[PDB]
Ligand binder design. Structure first.
Ligand SMILES: *[C@@H]1O[C@H](CO)[C@@H](O[C@@H]2O[C@H](CO)[C@@H](O[C@@H]3O[C@H](CO)[C@@H](O)[C@H](O[C@H]4O[C@H](CO)[C@@H](O)[C@H](O)[C@@H]4O)[C@@H]3O)[C@H](O)[C@H]2NC(C)=O)[C@H](O)[C@H]1NC(C)=O
Ligand SMILES: CCCCCCCCO[C@@H]1O[C@H](CO)[C@@H](O)[C@H](O)[C@H]1O
Ligand SMILES: CCCCCCCCO[C@@H]1O[C@H](CO)[C@@H](O)[C@H](O)[C@H]1O
Ligand SMILES: CCCCCCCCO[C@@H]1O[C@H](CO)[C@@H](O)[C@H](O)[C@H]1O
Ligand SMILES: *C(=O)CCCCCCCCCCCCCCC
Ligand SMILES: *C(=O)CCCCCCCCCCCCCCC
Length: 326
């Protein structure tokens, strides 16, 4: 027996020596050394110090530069906002709790922190999906006489909001639940205890299919077709070096974006799928925080890839940071 059950939690540590306390009431220093809790805090600090400026600057630069405010870019603003939900909902609260050694805000705080942290990263997830769809629609022109504009861009943003709520809300009202995870300082969806009262098994399948496989297929399809269309168009215009450049640049960025998507969610899903097969095993507190490393860090590397590697934004950023010139 490798864990310790309670009303609103599951501490991954045997209580056979009697040392296990609630993650809402007392420090979990039997679960991990105090210095490891400090390193958790150190990492949350890094994610905030990098994550806030990068994502805030994205919104600020867009307000100052008319050229950035195009319908396509609406979703990349949505991304930046989602990343800020991850920072202020997730990382800051985890920084606070990690320094105590347990989730001080209790079960209600666990639901809040879990909701906004889940909502944040899920909006970001679907933002990356909707961008691929919009880019696919715009480049491949799969529809007869269609023009992407403000109305469509806003629907795409609302679509992410809805999908993210379809993921984050149900645990608040019966279907699965939010409980402290890993080192017990941050809360999230329960996918490591078969909890019949909330039906965790169905929700995990629903999550795996609707919120990972479907996104993964849409992203691979949309960008697959986009790279196909661009490559055959360049092959029919090989005299233009500009077009050959643009073709290679687009293919390079698609590979970066697809690989980046996998790094973010494949570890989180690979571990989730493993627990579905091998249930109730001796999963450490650190083991649970390894997938969350890659996922939470996306709040920094997504805006680096999807926004700061754009030459247009990069100029506006320099201008805004240098007060007007340069
Ligand atoms: C992990 O295991 C440990 C060990 O079992 C466990 O901690 C223990 O919890 C029990 C309560 O569940 C504690 O027992 C209490 O001891 C105090 C003595 O001061 C009593 O006052 C408590 O109440 C009794 O007496 C009252 C008298 O008026 C009655 O009103 C009441 O009904 C009770 O009879 C109670 O006996 C025990 O002290 C700890 N032990 C240790 C070592 O901490 C812990 O709960 C487990 N963790 C999890 C998450 O499940
Ligand atoms: C940068 C944000 C500030 C975080 C302040 C952390 C306060 C930690 O407070 C600690 O909690 C222990 C219980 O776990 C108690 O022994 C004491 O209150 C204190 O040592
Ligand atoms: C990915 C599909 C497999 C099942 C996933 C279920 C667990 C979801 O886990 C969630 O991930 C979010 C990442 O955005 C974190 O912010 C949340 O804290 C966490 O609850
Ligand atoms: C979703 C997957 C995105 C499309 C990835 C295609 C990358 C293939 O690679 C591309 O074409 C040639 C090989 O086919 C290489 O020699 C080129 O360097 C490269 O641009
Ligand atoms: C335009 O005039 C150029 C920008 C002016 C600012 C140049 C100085 C940048 C230094 C940033 C250092 C970051 C410190 C990070 C420590 C945590
Ligand atoms: C806007 O007008 C661009 C200039 C603004 C920067 C003024 C000079 C910056 C000096 C660099 C100091 C960096 C130290 C960071 C402290 C942690």
């Amino acid at each position: 027996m490798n864990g310790t059950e309670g009303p609103n939690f599951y501490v991954p540590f045997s209580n056979k020596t009697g040392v296990v306390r609630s993650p809402f009431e007392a420090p979990q220093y039997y679960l991990a050394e105090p210095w490891q809790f400090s390193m958790l805090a150190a990492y949350m600090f890094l994610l905030i110090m990098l994550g806030f400026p990068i994502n805030f600057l994205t919104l600020y630069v867009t307000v100052q530069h008319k050229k950035l405010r195009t319908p396509l870019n609406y979703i990349l603003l949505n991304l930046a906002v989602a990343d800020l939900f991850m920072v202020f909902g997730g990382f800051t609260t985890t920084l606070y709790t990690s320094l105590h050694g347990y989730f001080v805000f209790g079960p209600t705080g666990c639901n809040l922190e879990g909701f906004f942290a889940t909502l944040g990263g899920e909006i970001a997830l679907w933002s990356l999906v909707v961008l691929a769809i919009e880019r696919y629609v715009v480049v491949c022109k799969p529809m007869s006489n269609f023009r992407f504009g403000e109305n469509h861009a806003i629907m795409g943003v609302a679509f992410t909001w809805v999908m993210a709520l379809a993921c984050a809300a149900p645990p608040l009202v019966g279907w699965s639940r939010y409980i402290p995870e890993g080192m017990q300082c941050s809360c999230g969806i329960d996918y490591y205890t078969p909890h019949e009262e909330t039906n965790n098994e169905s929700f995990v399948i629903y999550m795996f299919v609707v919120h990972f496989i479907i996104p993964l297929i849409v992203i691979f399809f949309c960008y697959g077709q986009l790279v196909f269309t661009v490559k055959e168009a360049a092959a029919q215009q090989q005299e233009s070096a500009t077009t050959q450049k643009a073709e290679k640049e687009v293919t390079r960025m698609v590979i970066i974006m697809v690989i980046a998507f996998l790094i973010c969610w494949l570890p989180y899903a690979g571990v989730a799928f493993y627990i579905f097969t091998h249930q109730g095993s001796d999963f450490g507190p650190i083991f649970m925080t390894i997938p969350a490393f890659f996922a939470k860090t996306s709040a920094v590397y997504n805006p680096v890839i999807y926004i700061m590697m754009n030459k247009q934004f990069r100029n506006c950023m320099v201008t805004t940071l240098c007060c007007g010139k340069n």
